[PDB]
Symmetry: D2
Amino acid sequence: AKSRIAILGTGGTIAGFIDSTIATTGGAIDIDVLIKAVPQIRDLADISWEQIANIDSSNMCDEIWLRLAKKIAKLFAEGIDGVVITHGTDTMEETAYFLNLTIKSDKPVVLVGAMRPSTAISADGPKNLYNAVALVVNKEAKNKGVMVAINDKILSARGVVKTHSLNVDAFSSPDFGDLGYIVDGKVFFYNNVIKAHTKNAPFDVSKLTSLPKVDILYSYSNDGSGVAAKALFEHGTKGIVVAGSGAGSIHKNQKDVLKELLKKGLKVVVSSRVVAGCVAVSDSDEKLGFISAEDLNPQKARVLLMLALTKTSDPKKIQEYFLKY
Amino acid sequence: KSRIAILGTGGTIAGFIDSTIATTGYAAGAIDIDVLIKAVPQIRDLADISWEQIANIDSSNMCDEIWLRLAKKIAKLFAEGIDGVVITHGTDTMEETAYFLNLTIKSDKPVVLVGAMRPSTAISADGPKNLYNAVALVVNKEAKNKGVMVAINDKILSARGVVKTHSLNVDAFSSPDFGDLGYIVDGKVFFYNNVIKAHTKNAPFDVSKLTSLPKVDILYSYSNDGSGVAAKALFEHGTKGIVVAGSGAGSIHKNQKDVLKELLKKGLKVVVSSRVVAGCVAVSDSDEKLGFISAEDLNPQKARVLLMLALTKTSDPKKIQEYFLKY
Amino acid sequence: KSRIAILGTGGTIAGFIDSTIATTGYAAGAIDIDVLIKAVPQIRDLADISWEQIANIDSSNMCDEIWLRLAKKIAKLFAEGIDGVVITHGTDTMEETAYFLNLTIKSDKPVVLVGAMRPSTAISADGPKNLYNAVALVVNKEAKNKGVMVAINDKILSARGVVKTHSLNVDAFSSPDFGDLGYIVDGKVFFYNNVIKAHTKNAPFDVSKLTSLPKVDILYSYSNDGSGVAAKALFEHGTKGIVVAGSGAGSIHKNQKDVLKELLKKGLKVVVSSRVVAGCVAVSDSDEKLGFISAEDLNPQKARVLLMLALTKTSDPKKIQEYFLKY
Amino acid sequence: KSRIAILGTGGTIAGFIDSTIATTGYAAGAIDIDVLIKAVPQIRDLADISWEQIANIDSSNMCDEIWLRLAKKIAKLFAEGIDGVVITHGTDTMEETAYFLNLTIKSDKPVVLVGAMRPSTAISADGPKNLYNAVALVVNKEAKNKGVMVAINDKILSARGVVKTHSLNVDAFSSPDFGDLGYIVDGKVFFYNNVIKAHTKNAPFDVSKLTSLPKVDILYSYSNDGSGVAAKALFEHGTKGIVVAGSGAGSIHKNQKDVLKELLKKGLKVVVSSRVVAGCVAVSDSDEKLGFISAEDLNPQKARVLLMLALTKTSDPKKIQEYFLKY
């Protein structure tokens, strides 16, 4: 008897179509039509599906994250064995980490997308979907954390980052490297991610309708973002993640303003515009409230800071979260 | 020997900390250029070495004024006989300073930026061998007309390609898209590639009579993007151009892009870049008509450099786009 | 409309197998080359296309015969007005063929090798896109005098730099030392570098009158190395040169190297390559007097090509070594 | 305070050369392990340090006897109260030694190999920070039961995954397939992963009574492969098993492969690996039935380690294959 797998659609290039077949950059397609490109998918599982959203992932929003988390918990309660989320590549890393911190089950939750529309020549979407379904039914897939499966690689939510903007091979874990690899429906695990997740993460969004407002600024030569920070704070921003230079260096023009705003209750997380590595926040700045995002990139750091702000307002406790999840 | 000028701007290669184990909580620009040089007597074999402190800052606090100062200083040095220049520089914004110099210096003579990931006081300090190698490169015969170069961790990277890609590791820089110009083995230089993007004498930007640059700032895009609030305030406070670190190949969340569209109609230039480390962005023909400019493969901070310089020549988005394709 | 010839050599791109999901157990070289073309209709829009099956084998079983023929057939074509050549090839030894042709083709006209990691019958087969991009490349006005190239997974790699660095992934090729020549997006060719190492017209190798090449074999170095016994046997059976894949930067275990030393004295040519994927090998001054030749950054199989061709002109280690510094 | 044994085997980390600039040509294995320890004082604050010199050699000359000696010494020290071990080792075959230990040490206590790419005496020598980090690691509470490790250049890599991927750079090691276990920041350890493949206690190999190991050699596949000759010679002179560095996903050119088939019928064990740095090998059912064994993702030299230990238990290809799927 087959595993019951549910596919939740959110949109994305994987379910898109463009008029040309050579053209990759950008209407919409039905998921039933996706499955007919990989019929044998129905051999791996008894497949049910629902539409959670239909967007370009670049347009992701909190509401979608909330629904997804609540939907997944509901289906797992009804004996769904695993979930595949068709998603766009642009913000897949963001959605992945969110669900990784909000879903209590040990059951497989896999995000999958494609770099080429369904009508392109050499479309990578069919194989990816196949592998994703093959991954969620595999017996070793429990307790791994939320995962991304693209281009035959299995990536952990906690580590996954988009590292090429155009190439079919678009994803990576710049600091952890892959959980494993897939060779024609055959799953091979290399690692277990140590960072605590799912049932072992203390975030409960079942009752929430919105999330604390967190936004993102950048740092550079002649930084003029001080202006942007004040304006964000005056418009309800509860938290700011800064993409610092090197290991979390924030240009003084901007840093003076953030210092002011710390004393007024803004939470400030220091992240980095650099793809690999960890940030360093001095003991001095930590005392002021600056929170280190460790190795978490700016958009992922935003995810954890938001969820942290549903529980506490104390920068010391928030820092504890960033050290653990 | 050939006449080589080493200019200090500060950085970690000149950084200090009382502990020998530590490499993370130091003060950048704590050491004079002329002290770093005595720590590596051998560089005096390679050339007639002279030096000068242009600044002693943490590169994260870089600013236009130093850039302008540095381009003028280098012009003057070359015009009075100096054969090549090494710049010691923090790593954080090194990629920015290099690309600016790549497009503003009118000589074929070698300009090399160098730095360290570890403070000069540290165990297995980074800086010494890096300075040695930088001097060896700038004295090499094949080093002319290469464009501005970053020489670090034995690798030779082009101004136009170089990006800091690790925040802690000694092997911290690469050319995500272009790939290294060359490699350095014990002072010996090997080139692999010619960079093809026009540079130096062939880049049309002149900063010699300028005391300021057009204001360009950077914004980011992500789920539930709120940068819209930010874009309007930057624009209201004199920001002339915005570089957006889009998701994917330069996608901008609808909340921010709507506002960008408003501000385009009011004279703001917008360059679309990417928060993604390698690859090019794509901008649709219709957004291009609106005035969105493709950063191509340049990242946000480097895209800002080119846009800034483009505003000293033109206001026409069409032509700014031609620059982004060429330089 | 350029006149472009596509030469079918075989490989996985012409691969077949019963299952659509399958990728490992296919039959490379089952599908005739003209079939593959009809499958990408947009191709005939880019050029006036012609084709011919030079061979339909597994690139695993590549040989000198095929290389000699292939280089002659291309010589012919470019003298009959053909503007560029695309070579569909298995992925396994594409890097060897590419480097050979790069040193043996006397034209400046584009020669692009292309292959696939998935058999033409698999879902999400990469072959058709790859074949499209290779035709786009060869037809491009800027593809002149670039060297022999490899066009696969949207990347454009030079023959002198290309190596397979993944055995299963469609992202299978890179240049661990030079880095990409350029990129392709949607038929559009973008060039980032020109490789400086001389090639084609400027390589002194002529194979037009050769029906065979000097015998050159490859050995590996490792802990408790037992290869000495292999070196002797090879030598006794006509081997004219041996390329060694040393550990690190060309270190050869004392057990093998001692044998290699006796053999040097009896006429054997020895080239020191490496088993490490990136970097350069370092041969000491005294090893080089013995006759050890450094491969520099060439990997073993690619180093084999240069040593082999080298032996059509000389047997002086001092001059082969110069060939390794230049090509 | 934990008791830590530092075992010296030589390597570049104990290398010496007259020049402070030069980084090639030195004599590896020149400095006593105690001198290297006394060079970094702070190490004494991390733990109660003892040291023994096991050998002082160039690691390209590693052999079975040193391996057996190491394995036994570690087992002994662990049973007599040592909390962790650090082995200073040459970088050339560090993969090999590391993986041997991974399969033969029946304890959960940390074992860490460390080395350097620059001789002790060179400027910006890496050795000292590497030795410090390695001690900090073996002392970390989280370091238990992680499998044998390589710590170098601030990275922590598992024996099962570690491979030397650059021949000259200080950043010389990675895990093409498994990635990194963690990172060190000034003796501050951060773990990211647990490797899943069985190691140490859960590995069934016992070399406690061995004075010798089964003879396993390595060959290479390439265009016009002539390795058949070397294979016959190796077999006849005593080789029990050969690993082949095949092209792409373990493809072996027909010339060598037909000879191996003949050798399979004579009791040769054949393991199929790849010259390709990342990815996993593919063997057909038909070939497996003849007795070809897939090395999976194990490179030639590390596959040799496992084939060799397997041969101490069984000569059954079916059984050896199960080992390659598990360890």
